[PDB]
Amino acid sequence: DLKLGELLLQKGWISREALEEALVEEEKTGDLLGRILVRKGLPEEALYRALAEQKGLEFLESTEGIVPDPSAALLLLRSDALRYGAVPIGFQNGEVEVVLSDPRHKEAVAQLLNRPARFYLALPQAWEELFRRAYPQ
Ligand SMILES: Nc1nc2c(ncn2[C@@H]2O[C@@H]3COP(=O)(O)O[C@H]4[C@@H](O)[C@H](n5cnc6c(=O)[nH]c(N)nc65)O[C@@H]4COP(=O)(O)O[C@H]3[C@H]2O)c(=O)[nH]1
């Protein structure tokens, strides 16, 4: 398994000098690497695509075509969907389909769901739009 920086290098979306500059700053700041890379010019979608591939998630280019299944939304309390950044949207072959806001949460969510699941990753704005449609307040 590759680290995020190596992944982006392999995909040609950052240079080695950009990575080394980010990693030297990270050693001096503690900030998340992806956050530093984006601040320095990496497209945020480049970040999420690499983060998706790293955690074995399907990157969702859009959430606009998704009609959330109310049955699937019941599998998580709204407050949990929010804090875990997970939207269950439907079912496929006996697995629940779940759209995450942060790939670092995949394991915490998968353990909670305790059932076969298919995980997707969406950009922040797209995720929030999907969450509000799935969990009206
Ligand atoms: N939602 C979100 N998740 C993010 C972001 N940036 C990184 N991550 C994810 O969070 C984990 C922790 O990243 P880190 O704190 O910067 O800690 C990283 C970083 O300090 C460092 N390092 C990361 N990439 C490289 C690299 O390419 N070369 C070298 N020498 N060190 C690296 O290794 C540690 C673990 O790397 P990873 O396996 O890739 O594990 C990463 C990665 O899966 C972000 O901006 N948003």
Residue numbers in the entry: 165 to 301
Give me lines lifted from the publication on this model.
One target protein for c‐di‐GMP is PilF, a hexameric ATPase from the thermophilic bacterium Thermus thermophilus important for pilus formation, cell motility, and DNA uptake from the environment. The N‐terminus of PilF contains three homologous so‐called general secretory pathway II (GSPII) domains, GSPII‐A, ‐B, and ‐C. Our recent structures of GSPII‐B (PilF159‐302) showed that the two nucleotide building blocks of c‐di‐GMP are recognized by the protein in a very similar manner through a duplicated amino acid sequence motif. In the GSPII‐B complex with c‐di‐GMP, both c‐di‐GMP phosphodiester groups accept a hydrogen bond from a backbone amide group of a conserved leucine (L168 from the first motif and L197 from the second motif) and from a side chain amino group of a conserved glutamine (Q190 from the first motif and Q218 from the second motif).
To gain insights into the structural basis for the pH‐dependent ligand recognition, we crystallized both the Q190E and the Q218E single‐site mutant of the PilF GSPII‐B domain in complex with c‐di‐GMP using very similar crystallization conditions at pH 7.0. Due to the high‐quality electron density maps for both mutants, their ligand recognition mode could be discerned in detail. In both the Q190E and the Q218E single point mutants, one phosphodiester‐binding pocket can be found in the mutant configuration and the other one in the WT configuration due to the duplication of the c‐di‐GMP phosphodiester binding motifs. Importantly, the carboxylate groups of the newly introduced glutamate sidechains in either of the two Q/E mutants were found to still point directly towards a non‐bridging oxygen atom of the phosphodiester groups for the carboxamide groups of the native glutamine side chains. The shortest distances between the oxygen atoms of the glutamate carboxylate groups and the phosphodiester groups were found to be 2.6 Å (Q190E) and 2.5 Å (Q218E), respectively, which is well below the sum of the van der Waals radii of the two oxygen atoms. Finally, the lengths of the hydrogen bonds from E190 to the 2′‐OH group of c‐di‐GMP in the Q190E mutant and from E218 to the 2′‐OH group in the Q218E mutant are increased by 0.4 Å if compared to the native sites in both constructs (red numbers). While the c‐di‐GMP binding affinity of the WT protein is similar at pH 4.0 and 8.5 according to ITC titration experiments, both mutants display a drastic increase in ligand affinity at lower pH. The affinity of the Q190E mutant for c‐di‐GMP increased ∼ 20fold with the KD changing from ∼ 800 nM at pH 8.5 to ∼ 40 nM at pH 4.5. Fitting the KD’s measured over a pH range from 4.0 to 8.5 to this formula yielded pKa values of 7.5 and 6.3 for the Q190E/c‐di‐GMP complex and the free Q190E mutant protein, respectively.
